[PDB]
Amino acid sequence: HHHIEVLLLDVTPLSLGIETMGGVMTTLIAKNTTIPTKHSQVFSTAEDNQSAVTIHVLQGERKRAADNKSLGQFNLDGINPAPRGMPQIEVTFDIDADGILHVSAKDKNSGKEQKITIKANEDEIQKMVRDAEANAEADRKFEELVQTRNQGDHLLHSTRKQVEEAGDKLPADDKTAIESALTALETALKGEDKAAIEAKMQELAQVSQKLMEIAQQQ
Amino acid sequence: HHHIEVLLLDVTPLSLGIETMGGVMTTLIAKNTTIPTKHSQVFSTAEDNQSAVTIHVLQGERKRAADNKSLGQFNLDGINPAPRGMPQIEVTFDIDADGILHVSAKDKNSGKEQKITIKASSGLNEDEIQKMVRDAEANAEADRKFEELVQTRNQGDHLLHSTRKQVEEAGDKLPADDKTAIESALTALETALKGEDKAAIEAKMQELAQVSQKLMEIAQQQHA
Ligand SMILES: [Ca+2]
Ligand SMILES: [Ca+2]
Ligand SMILES: [Ca+2]
C-alpha cells in the first residue's frame, strides 16, 4: 500500500514574514500553517546597484510593518552590482518541532548567506488578531496602495531612463507630453489614492508608445 | 543597507498539494501564494513496514483528492522497514520564476529521493480555475465534513492498530473479562469507522479507553 499520511505536530499562532518596500509586511508563513515547516520566497533589490539588503522579521496579521511584532533584524551584504530586480535573494523561514524559527537570506548568484535564530501569550495573540480584524479594510487598502506605488515608482524611473537615452531620437511633442505625464505620476505617488495613480500610470503609458521602438532600434 | 522587494507579483491561482491517507488533498502551497516560492512539509507512511509511497500531485480547492485536478504522480521507493508514522518523508513543492512546479520527496533515513517536474498548462485553464472556485464555495461544508471525518477515521485506525498491538505485545498477562471486553470495544470501534458519523467514532474511542486500564498498566510495567 502506497499511502502517505500527514504529521500534525503543531500550528502557527500568527503570520510570519519580512518587511518589504513601502513598509509592508510580506508573509512567508501564514497563521495556522502546520509545524514543522519550511517556506521560502525569492526577493530582490529596490535600487540599481544595491549592494545589501535588510531582513526585518515580523510577526502578526497587520499589513503595516510597525503595526506588527518585530522579531529580529539582520543584513545580507556583498550583493553584486546589477539593476534593481535583477539580484535574486531567497529568504527561508524554517520552523522546527521545538517551535524555534530560523530565518536565512541567500544570494543565488554570489552564494553569500546570512541567518539568525529566533526563540519564542494567548491574551497578546488574541489582542493582535482582534486588532487586525478591526482595521482589516484600512490594512487591505494600504497594501494595495503600496503595491500600486512600487509599480508606479518603477514606471517613473524606467520611463525617465529610457527618455534620457532616447534622444535626440524621441521627437518634441512626445517628449513634452511624456515629461508632463511623468510629473503627474510623481505627484500621484505621494497621495493615498490608488485609482489616481493607476490613472497616471495609464496616461503615461499612452503617450509613451514611440519610446519602445526608439529603444528597440539601435 | 537598503530596501528589499518582492521579485514577482504573480500568484498561484489554486492550491497545490498531495493526496494523503483517506483520499484527502493536503495543501503544501495555498492559493494566492506569491511566486517564486518553496514550501516543504514532513509526512510519513500509513502502514507498518511500508516500502514505498505514492506522491500524487493535486491542484484545486476541493477536499476529496479526486475532486481536484491531478497534475502528476511519482513513487518514492526504498523505504526501510518501520512502524507507521516512523519514516520521515520530506515533500517539497518549488515554483520558480518561470511558473514551473517541481515536486520532490526524500526519505531521511534511507536518503532516497525522487522528483518530477510539472509544466504550466498541465493544470487548469482560466475558465476551469473559476469553475473550481465556484465548485469549492458550493461544496465547502460537505468537503469540510469529509475532511474531519477522514481525520477522525485515521486517529481511530491508529488507536485500533495500536491497541491490538498491545494485546499482541503481551498481551495475556491480560485476564478473562478484560481481553473479551477490549476486543468487543475494538470491534465496535472498527465497525464505527465504517460509519459516516464522526461523533460516534470519537465515542467508540473514549469507550475503548474505558475498557483499557489493565492494558495500560501492564504495558506501563513492561516498558518501565
Ligand atoms: Ca495516500
Ligand atoms: Ca511562502
Ligand atoms: Ca524594506
PDB file of C-alpha atoms in Angstrom, chain A residues 1-8 18-23 26 28 34 36-47 50-55 75 84-91 108 147 150-151 154, chain B residues 1-9 18-22 26 28 34-47 50-55 75 77 84-85 87-89 91 94 97 151 154 158:
ATOM      1  CA  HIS A   1       0.000   0.000   0.000  1.00  0.00           C
ATOM      2  CA  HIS A   2       1.425   3.297  -1.181  1.00  0.00           C
ATOM      3  CA  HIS A   3      -0.435   5.741   1.105  1.00  0.00           C
ATOM      4  CA  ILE A   4       1.213   8.683   2.863  1.00  0.00           C
ATOM      5  CA  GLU A   5      -0.046  10.476   5.978  1.00  0.00           C
ATOM      6  CA  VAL A   6       0.183  13.989   7.358  1.00  0.00           C
ATOM      7  CA  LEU A   7       2.194  14.554  10.522  1.00  0.00           C
ATOM      8  CA  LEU A   8       0.484  17.310  12.521  1.00  0.00           C
ATOM      9  CA  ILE A  18       9.560  40.188   6.487  1.00  0.00           C
ATOM     10  CA  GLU A  19       9.264  43.910   5.889  1.00  0.00           C
ATOM     11  CA  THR A  20       9.339  44.889   2.222  1.00  0.00           C
ATOM     12  CA  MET A  21       9.364  48.122   0.209  1.00  0.00           C
ATOM     13  CA  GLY A  22       6.820  50.674   1.405  1.00  0.00           C
ATOM     14  CA  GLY A  23       6.998  49.419   4.967  1.00  0.00           C
ATOM     15  CA  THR A  26       5.049  40.284   3.373  1.00  0.00           C
ATOM     16  CA  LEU A  28       6.309  33.845   4.273  1.00  0.00           C
ATOM     17  CA  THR A  34       1.224  23.285  10.328  1.00  0.00           C
ATOM     18  CA  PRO A  36       7.344  21.847  11.419  1.00  0.00           C
ATOM     19  CA  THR A  37       7.501  23.572   8.036  1.00  0.00           C
ATOM     20  CA  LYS A  38       9.865  25.288   5.649  1.00  0.00           C
ATOM     21  CA  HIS A  39       8.729  28.142   3.410  1.00  0.00           C
ATOM     22  CA  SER A  40      10.959  30.262   1.189  1.00  0.00           C
ATOM     23  CA  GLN A  41      10.387  33.039  -1.314  1.00  0.00           C
ATOM     24  CA  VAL A  42      12.655  34.983  -3.666  1.00  0.00           C
ATOM     25  CA  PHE A  43      13.036  38.753  -3.363  1.00  0.00           C
ATOM     26  CA  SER A  44      15.191  41.393  -4.991  1.00  0.00           C
ATOM     27  CA  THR A  45      16.851  44.789  -4.638  1.00  0.00           C
ATOM     28  CA  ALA A  46      14.842  48.005  -4.775  1.00  0.00           C
ATOM     29  CA  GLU A  47      17.667  50.056  -6.319  1.00  0.00           C
ATOM     30  CA  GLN A  50      22.242  47.993  -4.443  1.00  0.00           C
ATOM     31  CA  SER A  51      24.923  46.074  -2.535  1.00  0.00           C
ATOM     32  CA  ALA A  52      22.977  44.915   0.528  1.00  0.00           C
ATOM     33  CA  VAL A  53      19.516  44.205   1.929  1.00  0.00           C
ATOM     34  CA  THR A  54      17.996  44.359   5.394  1.00  0.00           C
ATOM     35  CA  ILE A  55      15.854  41.433   6.558  1.00  0.00           C
ATOM     36  CA  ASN A  75      21.731  42.227   6.865  1.00  0.00           C
ATOM     37  CA  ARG A  84      17.009  46.732  -9.415  1.00  0.00           C
ATOM     38  CA  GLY A  85      15.023  43.500  -9.609  1.00  0.00           C
ATOM     39  CA  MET A  86      17.906  41.570 -11.106  1.00  0.00           C
ATOM     40  CA  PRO A  87      19.516  40.036  -7.991  1.00  0.00           C
ATOM     41  CA  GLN A  88      17.651  37.075  -6.514  1.00  0.00           C
ATOM     42  CA  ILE A  89      17.620  36.825  -2.726  1.00  0.00           C
ATOM     43  CA  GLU A  90      15.977  33.694  -1.380  1.00  0.00           C
ATOM     44  CA  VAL A  91      14.587  34.141   2.113  1.00  0.00           C
ATOM     45  CA  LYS A 108      21.819  32.801  -5.546  1.00  0.00           C
ATOM     46  CA  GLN A 147       1.901  47.618  -4.403  1.00  0.00           C
ATOM     47  CA  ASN A 150       6.047  50.497  -6.077  1.00  0.00           C
ATOM     48  CA  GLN A 151       4.777  49.691  -9.561  1.00  0.00           C
ATOM     49  CA  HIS A 154       9.283  51.660 -11.122  1.00  0.00           C
TER      50      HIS A 154
ATOM     51  CA  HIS B   1      21.833  48.646   3.631  1.00  0.00           C
ATOM     52  CA  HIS B   2      18.570  49.242   1.762  1.00  0.00           C
ATOM     53  CA  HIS B   3      15.034  48.083   0.946  1.00  0.00           C
ATOM     54  CA  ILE B   4      14.059  44.615  -0.244  1.00  0.00           C
ATOM     55  CA  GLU B   5      11.164  43.924  -2.608  1.00  0.00           C
ATOM     56  CA  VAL B   6       9.020  41.096  -3.905  1.00  0.00           C
ATOM     57  CA  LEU B   7      10.511  39.719  -7.114  1.00  0.00           C
ATOM     58  CA  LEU B   8       7.315  38.793  -8.943  1.00  0.00           C
ATOM     59  CA  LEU B   9       3.731  39.920  -8.412  1.00  0.00           C
ATOM     60  CA  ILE B  18      -0.649  15.925  -2.440  1.00  0.00           C
ATOM     61  CA  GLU B  19      -3.104  13.131  -1.755  1.00  0.00           C
ATOM     62  CA  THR B  20      -2.893  11.754   1.777  1.00  0.00           C
ATOM     63  CA  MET B  21      -4.484   8.874   3.653  1.00  0.00           C
ATOM     64  CA  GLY B  22      -8.239   8.579   3.213  1.00  0.00           C
ATOM     65  CA  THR B  26      -3.300  18.103   1.849  1.00  0.00           C
ATOM     66  CA  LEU B  28       1.573  22.358   0.508  1.00  0.00           C
ATOM     67  CA  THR B  34       3.399  34.704  -4.367  1.00  0.00           C
ATOM     68  CA  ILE B  35       5.922  33.203  -6.791  1.00  0.00           C
ATOM     69  CA  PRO B  36       8.694  32.047  -6.849  1.00  0.00           C
ATOM     70  CA  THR B  37       8.183  30.068  -3.677  1.00  0.00           C
ATOM     71  CA  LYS B  38       9.317  26.885  -1.974  1.00  0.00           C
ATOM     72  CA  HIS B  39       7.240  25.041   0.636  1.00  0.00           C
ATOM     73  CA  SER B  40       8.163  21.787   2.333  1.00  0.00           C
ATOM     74  CA  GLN B  41       6.496  19.582   4.916  1.00  0.00           C
ATOM     75  CA  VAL B  42       7.220  16.245   6.591  1.00  0.00           C
ATOM     76  CA  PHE B  43       4.971  13.227   6.081  1.00  0.00           C
ATOM     77  CA  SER B  44       5.139   9.533   6.958  1.00  0.00           C
ATOM     78  CA  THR B  45       3.915   6.061   5.994  1.00  0.00           C
ATOM     79  CA  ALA B  46       0.367   4.931   6.832  1.00  0.00           C
ATOM     80  CA  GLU B  47       1.218   1.234   7.313  1.00  0.00           C
ATOM     81  CA  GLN B  50       5.696   0.119   4.099  1.00  0.00           C
ATOM     82  CA  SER B  51       8.479   0.171   1.475  1.00  0.00           C
ATOM     83  CA  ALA B  52       7.210   2.923  -0.827  1.00  0.00           C
ATOM     84  CA  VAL B  53       4.867   5.897  -1.021  1.00  0.00           C
ATOM     85  CA  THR B  54       2.959   7.411  -3.940  1.00  0.00           C
ATOM     86  CA  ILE B  55       3.178  11.178  -4.295  1.00  0.00           C
ATOM     87  CA  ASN B  75       6.733   6.899  -6.374  1.00  0.00           C
ATOM     88  CA  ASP B  77      10.648   3.591  -3.181  1.00  0.00           C
ATOM     89  CA  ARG B  84       3.646   3.564  10.505  1.00  0.00           C
ATOM     90  CA  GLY B  85       4.432   7.180  11.386  1.00  0.00           C
ATOM     91  CA  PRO B  87       9.693   7.233   8.475  1.00  0.00           C
ATOM     92  CA  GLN B  88      10.185  10.925   7.855  1.00  0.00           C
ATOM     93  CA  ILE B  89       9.454  11.866   4.275  1.00  0.00           C
ATOM     94  CA  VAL B  91       7.873  16.646   0.441  1.00  0.00           C
ATOM     95  CA  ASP B  94       9.039  24.544  -5.585  1.00  0.00           C
ATOM     96  CA  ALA B  97      10.103  32.405 -11.712  1.00  0.00           C
ATOM     97  CA  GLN B 151      -9.006  12.761  10.297  1.00  0.00           C
ATOM     98  CA  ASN B 154      -7.273   7.933  10.793  1.00  0.00           C
ATOM     99  CA  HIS B 158      -4.302   4.246  14.737  1.00  0.00           C
TER     100      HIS B 158
END
